[PDB]
Amino acid sequence: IDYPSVSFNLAGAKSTTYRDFLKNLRDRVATGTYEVNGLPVLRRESEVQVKNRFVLVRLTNYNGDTVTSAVDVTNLYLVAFSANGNSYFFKDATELQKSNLFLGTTQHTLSFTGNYDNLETAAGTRRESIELGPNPLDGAITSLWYDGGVARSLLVLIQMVPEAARFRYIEQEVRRSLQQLTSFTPNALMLSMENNWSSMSLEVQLSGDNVSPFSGTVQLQNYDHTPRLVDNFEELYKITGIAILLFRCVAT
């Protein structure tokens, strides 16, 4: 199926051109009226057809060489990506994505799932040192285009798009990155909220709509690595700048 897609060319790209891109990417995966406090809640396997099961992301590198990675509308996960008659799928790869994504290219699966821990272990490094930004993005798309697509470059993308798609904090972190044309490395906070998507997810659905207090607490992390426990929604938003909620439970 000709799944919808968005584009973002690093060349002649400004901060606003990036912000708008993520916005469009959100307007797709973020549909349905199941939302709380305004923030939408990504659908689930049952309430979603294959015809709209996946979305395609188009990223054009400096040299024009553009690579595309399809995200899962049910979690903003990077399902796969293609490059010049070539397609790749993590060690998992379901027949759903293997028989509906980039049909026509070589379907050679990699050897590691899209799990953050999996990628890091394959790249021999961790997110806390895989600097992201304008140039880092270029090397990412490029590497995935020629080298066939390694783990490192992959991690560079995930945090740059889906991650910045749910967390506006990473958004401005990147918007400022291209603005000053400088790179940067993920801090303890960005990484903290990066691992508490599912946690804060139900922690917001638990309280319910138009509710501030949380039934529990979110284990965030400050720069000094110290624990930052957020008990209210207003706090979670004013810090993580979340804008996308993953399904965990339904209203009561």
């Binding site: 207003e234 004013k238 810090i239 009561t252």
Partner: protein, 263 residues
């Protein structure tokens, strides 16, 4: 489908003015004891438990209202005997604790230590702003709005416009108090105030007093909307050169979007 889950009780603090915490007088678990603002601290009278039934309480004595009528104060008394209605409370994301049955909200006439609280006619004021949380410590942040520029605070009674982001200038260091008010970190004496409720109304950095203008609700869409008047703060005609942030009917445009970045 997949029903959620009934949440168990939890003990969280309460604040809503001058960084003052809500607690019971002398922490006396006796009935009738009223509620009042008082500097936060590790103590039961300051500790509050929330239940599914919609009841908040400390020391095991339900936090119920004393007499029902716009102007009545609050106090603690046994749950059982407590008036079925004068015991339930609602805490919306608007930073307000409104009493269902009645419709009044926990108001704080004056943000002074040892000041007793009291239900009143909800009019959307800093006084009627409360944020339940164990972390009574606000968070430092810069409001990056239009063209990746940060909101800057000039002089007292002066305006407030978008200046080149600088993570060093204290004028850009905004402190978000639990009372739903935005005060300058350098000097938490003045709060972001408006000059009216009509479109194009100019914004400034007036003093803090709990005025309905000093109330700012951070809409999840990314816009800092004013509660009293549905208007939202933005950049006049987008021209940052004009040097002025004002209230204006929502449009859903980027010139009305604001981000709050950590320290």
């Amino acid at each position: 489908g997949e029903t959620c889950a009934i949440p168990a009780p939890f003990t969280r603090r309460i604040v809503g003015r001058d960084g003052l915490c809500v607690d019971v007088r002398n922490g006396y678990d006796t009935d009738g004891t009223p509620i009042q603002l008082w500097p936060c601290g590790t103590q039961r009278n300051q500790q509050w438990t929330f239940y599914n039934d919609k009841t908040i309480r400390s020391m095991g004595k339900c936090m119920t209202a004393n007499g029902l009528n716009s102007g009545s104060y609050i106090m603690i008394t046994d749950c059982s005997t407590a008036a079925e209605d004068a015991t339930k409370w609602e805490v919306l994301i608007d930073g307000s604790i409104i009493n269902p049955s009645s419709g009044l909200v926990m108001t704080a006439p004056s943000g002074a230590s040892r000041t007793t609280l009291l239900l009143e006619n909800n009019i959307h004021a800093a006084s009627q702003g409360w944020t339940v949380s164990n972390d009574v410590q606000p968070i430092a942040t810069l409001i990056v709005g239009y063209n990746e520029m940060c909101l800057q605070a000039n002089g007292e009674n002066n305006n407030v416009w978008m200046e080149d982001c600088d993570v060093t200038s204290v004028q850009q260091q905004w402190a978000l108090f639990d009372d739903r008010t935005i005060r300058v970190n350098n000097s938490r004496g003045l709060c972001v105030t408006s000059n009216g409720y009509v479109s194009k109304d100019l914004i400034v950095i007036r003093k803090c007093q709990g005025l309905a203008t000093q109330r700012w609700f951070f809409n999840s869409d990314g816009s800092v909307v004013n509660l009293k008047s549905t208007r939202v703060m933005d950049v006049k005609e987008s021209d940052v050169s004009l040097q002025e942030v004002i209230i204006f009917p929502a449009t859903g445009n980027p010139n009305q979007q604001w981000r709050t970045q950590v320290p």
